Design a protein around this ligand. Structure first.
Ligand SMILES: [Mg+2]
Ligand SMILES: [Zn+2]
Ligand SMILES: [Zn+2]
Ligand SMILES: [Zn+2]
Ligand SMILES: [Zn+2]
Lengths: 34, 49, 49, 157, 23, 150, 37, 68, 48, 261
RNA sequence: GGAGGUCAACAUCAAGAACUGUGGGCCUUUGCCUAUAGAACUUAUAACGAACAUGGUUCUUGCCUUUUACCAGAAC
């Protein structure tokens, strides 16, 4: 399973984009909520 | 008839009558055979008329 | 982007189920006791009173 | 085995003759029931049928009283009757059961045929229908089981 | 209801059992 | 990638080898010209379709017609095989797109829409599952479950 | 009063009520698919 | 549930058909529809009847019919 | 004949007695085992 | 009460007496499915009823009463009912109470328990519409009186009044001299239906007058549903009635609407 | 509780000469190897039926004005 597959996300992202990806996922799959 | 077999149909287990008798509308009895022949002739004749 | 993966495993699911509902809805309609082998109160009326 | 006197049929047992007249009065009436007395109205038709069912009931009740009440006949005469279709084996067997002593028919206890639930109102004691009637004060609308013509099979009434 | 009440009560029906008409 | 299937205007279909270009076999069976041919991924099936109003399946194993789908009013110019559903999509001068159930040969869904003949049809796994193009100079993106233009 | 000038839209036939006659060629046949590997 | 079928007097059947012989009333409007339907099942009834022929040594067979 | 309606079983036929069938004389001595039940409708119904 | 309520209904006609089916020889051969005749067309088939009712004489209690059925026996309305007190439906002329019971279901279907159709009928035939409450019967084919010509229209008028008058509460009646038609109007839709089915195909004058014993050869009188009234007067009268009644139900609307809040 | 029933429902009946459960080891559930228990019915001149009908499509024919109805072989 890819890291992209694990997050169920699509495949040169910036360090900023990396942060934003986590933030987006956090909103969706927040462990404290789900 | 020996050369070309058929090898019937499992799930055929459902038959016309077993399905038919189930309903309100069919009732069972005995009767003399000749009488069933005559009834069936009258049945048929009414049907085609 | 092409449409991921676990997105198509959804559309395929719901569409597949829907088409099955149509087909099975048809095969139980038509005149064959044969064709049916290839196949709730549900009403809260008004205020449900 | 058949009603007919076909050569295979074994001759009557001993006690038969005494009861032959009583049975013949039933037979001669069934002749008159199926003669096709014509009627326009539905009610009258299924009334005609009710005649037949009730006659059948009465005959089998006669024999049942002979063997299982008075014991006025032998076992062999009885079995010979059943094999000759003067009686209804299954129906009698219901009569021997606890709750069914007065029963109409075997249709009236059919659970499957009737739409919801089962067992014609033909089987429900008047004692009760008078009570649910009493709640409405509409009296009671029931008269005849459509299959039979029964009014209260239930063995209390 | 009571057994005596029923036994007495039924003979009211016109014709024995069970085709006998209540009323 | 071992071969072609090529329609023709002579009614045949000739299966050519891609490597050397030699001719493997010929599949006859249509009485008029064959407008479209489509081969399946998941299945060993070949769906051909023609101007004779008929969509014929072909079993690649035995090379014989298996099924006929029925119900177009007139010549059927396009077949496309839905990727994941075991469906066919056919279309032609009917001016409607017929979604065929591959197994039972039942024209399950019909897509009313274009005001003229339908030239070319495609299938996609997610939404719009059918794209269509017609001589009314439009291209519609269909939603099949609801059965109307997305 | 001759030729086609148009074709019949299947749309029309889509709105009619079904008859339910049973044809000979829709009787069940080749009732099982085949999947490739 | 499932109580088996209820066997009935033959006189009953004889009365049913014996009645429907003449039908002109309006009360028959379903039964008429009912006849044409059964036209589809007849040849089956012809089979089941004709395979039960009584054979020479028997005088009269007696069978179980299922009637509408 | 075509004009004669089929005669009703509940009247003409049912009263009139069956008039013996084929059978065979058999033999008393040789067939002693099978003489009895051979021509029954269903040959053996009640036997354990 | 003293008349109808106590005295149980009496069989009008013995079942053996009822007319046979298979009406007579309108054509060459009989047809089994539809009940009519085959080839050729005989002179048009219509005939006076051998039967009629007698409101106080026949009508009486029946089983529906105890069973609380809503709907009236039409074979009673034709006085042809052979089931007598055994009948499933009510035998008596509709009153205001019973219409009170029907009031919910009188919208879709007539008093006899038959669904109404939408459009009436080409000739204004048997049963009405559920669009329009129509209380007005057209009486026509007045030659149901056969060929006797009468001293005045007060003969026709008077006789009709005494006919329908029994069948229910009449709001008005007008015979027309020029074109032979009566127009009769009732309080209630129900009585209109009942009277229509009651008096269709009937005869006239006295239990015995003149040609009376030949009455059965007559054609019998059409009772059909009546069109609107073209004259301005009654048109005003309708418009007003509709107005005041609309006004009357606005009271209900504001009472239960006021309860809605 | 025993015998039955021209009673019903639900399972199963054409295949690596072929079934299922369980114990243990390896890979990482599947799958392979090893150990153990039980296998009704149907099969070798092969099959549930010691019997034997029809229909559809596709080819080849045969009658032969054309369609139904057909002639007699094959494959599915
Ligand atoms: Mg031609
Ligand atoms: Zn009963
Ligand atoms: Zn009952
Ligand atoms: Zn009863
Ligand atoms: Zn009545």
């Amino acid at each position: 399973l890819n890291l992209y597959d694990v997050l169920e996300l699509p495949t040169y992202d910036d360090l900023p984009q990396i942060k934003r990806k986590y933030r987006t996922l956090a909103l969706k799959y927040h462990p404290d909520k789900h | 008839n020996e050369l070309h077999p058929t090898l019937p149909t499992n799930h055929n287990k459902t038959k016309l009558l077993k399905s038919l008798k189930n309903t309100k509308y069919f009732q069972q009895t005995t009767i003399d055979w000749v009488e069933a022949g005559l009834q069936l002739c009258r049945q048929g004749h009414n049907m085609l008329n | 982007p092409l449409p991921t993966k676990a997105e198509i495993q959804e559309c395929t699911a719901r569409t597949k189920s829907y088409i099955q509902r149509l087909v099975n809805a048809k095969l139980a309609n038509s005149n064959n006791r044969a064709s049916s082998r290839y196949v709730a109160p549900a009403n809260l009326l008004l205020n449900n009173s | 085995m058949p009603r007919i006197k076909t050569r295979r049929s074994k001759p009557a047992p001993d006690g038969f003759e005494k009861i032959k007249p009583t049975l013949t009065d039933f037979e001669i009436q069934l002749r008159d029931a199926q003669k096709d007395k014509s009627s326009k109205l539905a009610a009258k038709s299924n009334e005609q049928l009710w005649e037949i069912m009730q006659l059948h009931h009465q005959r089998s009740r006669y024999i049942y009283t002979l063997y299982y009440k008075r014991k006025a006949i032998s076992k062999d005469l009885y079995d010979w009757l059943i094999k000759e279709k003067y009686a209804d084996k299954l129906l009698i067997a219901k009569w021997r059961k606890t709750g069914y002593e007065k029963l109409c028919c075997l249709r009236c206890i059919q659970k499957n045929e009737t739409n919801n639930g089962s067992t014609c109102i033909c089987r429900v004691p008047r004692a009760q229908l008078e009570e649910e009637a009493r709640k409405k004060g509409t009296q009671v609308s029931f008269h005849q089981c459509v299959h039979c013509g029964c009014r209260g099979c239930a063995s209390t009434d | 209801f009571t057994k005596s009440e029923l036994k007495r009560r039924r003979k009211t029906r016109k014709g024995d059992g069970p085709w006998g008409s209540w009323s | 990638n071992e071969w072609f299937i090529t329609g023709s205007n002579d009614t045949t279909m000739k299966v050519w080898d891609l490597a050397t270009g030699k001719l493997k076999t010929t599949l006859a069976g249509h009485v008029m010209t064959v407008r479209d041919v489509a081969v399946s991924d998941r299945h060993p099936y070949l769906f051909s379709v023609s101007e004779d109003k008929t969509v014929k399946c072909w079993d690649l194993e035995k090379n014989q017609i298996i099924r006929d789908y029925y119900g177009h009013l007139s010549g059927v110019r396009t077949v496309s095989i839905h990727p994941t559903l075991d469906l066919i999509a056919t279309a032609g001068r009917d001016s409607v797109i017929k979604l065929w159930d591959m197994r039972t040969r039942i024209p399950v869904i019909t897509l009313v829409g274009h005001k003229g003949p339908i030239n070319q049809v495609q299938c996609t796994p997610v939404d719009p599952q059918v794209v269509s193009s017609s001589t009314d100079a439009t291209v519609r993106l269909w939603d099949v479950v609801a059965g109307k233009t997305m | 009063h001759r030729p086609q000038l148009e074709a019949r839209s299947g749309a029309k036939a889509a709105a009619y009520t079904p008859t339910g006659i049973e044809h000979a060629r829709l009787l069940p046949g080749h009732t099982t698919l085949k999947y490739r590997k | 549930l499932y109580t088996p079928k209820a066997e009935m007097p033959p006189e009953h059947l004889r009365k049913i058909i014996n009645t429907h012989s003449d039908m002109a009333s309006k009360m028959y409007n379903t039964d008429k529809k009912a006849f044409l339907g059964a036209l589809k099942y007849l040849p089956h009834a012809i089979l089941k009847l004709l395979e039960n022929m009584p054979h020479p040594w028997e005088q009269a067979k007696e069978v179980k019919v299922l009637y509408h | 004949d075509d004009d004669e309606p089929p005669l009703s079983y509940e009247q003409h036929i049912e009263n009139i007695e069956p008039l013996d069938p084929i059978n065979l004389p058999l033999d008393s001595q040789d067939d002693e085992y099978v003489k009895d039940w051979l021509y029954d409708s269903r040959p053996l119904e009640e036997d354990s | 009460m003293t008349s109808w309520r106590d005295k149980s209904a009496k069989v009008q006609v013995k079942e053996s007496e009822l007319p046979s089916s298979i009406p007579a020889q309108t054509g060459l051969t009989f047809n089994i499915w539809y009940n009519k005749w085959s080839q050729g067309f005989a002179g048009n088939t219509r005939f006076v009823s051998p039967f009629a009712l007698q409101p106080q004489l026949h009508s009486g209690k029946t089983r529906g009463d105890n069973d609380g059925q809503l709907f009236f026996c039409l074979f009673f309305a034709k006085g042809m009912c052979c089931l007598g007190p055994k009948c499933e439906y009510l035998h008596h002329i509709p009153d205001e109470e019973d219409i009170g019971k029907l009031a919910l279901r009188t919208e879709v279907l007539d008093c006899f328990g038959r669904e109404k159709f939408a459009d009436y009928r080409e000739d204004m035939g048997g049963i009405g519409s559920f669009r329009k409450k129509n209380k007005t019967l057209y009486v026509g084919g007045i030659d149901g009186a056969l060929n006797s010509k009468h001293l005045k229209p007060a003969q026709i008028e008077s006789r009709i009044r005494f006919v329908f008058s029994r069948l229910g509460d009449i709001d008005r009646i007008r015979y027309v001299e020029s074109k032979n038609c009566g127009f009769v109007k009732f309080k209630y839709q129900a009585n209109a239906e009942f009277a229509k089915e009651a008096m269709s195909n009937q005869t006239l004058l006295l239990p015995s007058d003149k040609e009376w014993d030949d009455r059965r050869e007559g054609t019998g009188l059409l009772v059909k549903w009546a069109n609107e009234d073209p004259d301005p007067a009654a048109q005003k009268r309708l418009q007003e009635e509709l107005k005041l009644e609309s006004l009357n139900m606005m009271v209900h609307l504001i009472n239960n609407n006021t309860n809605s809040a």
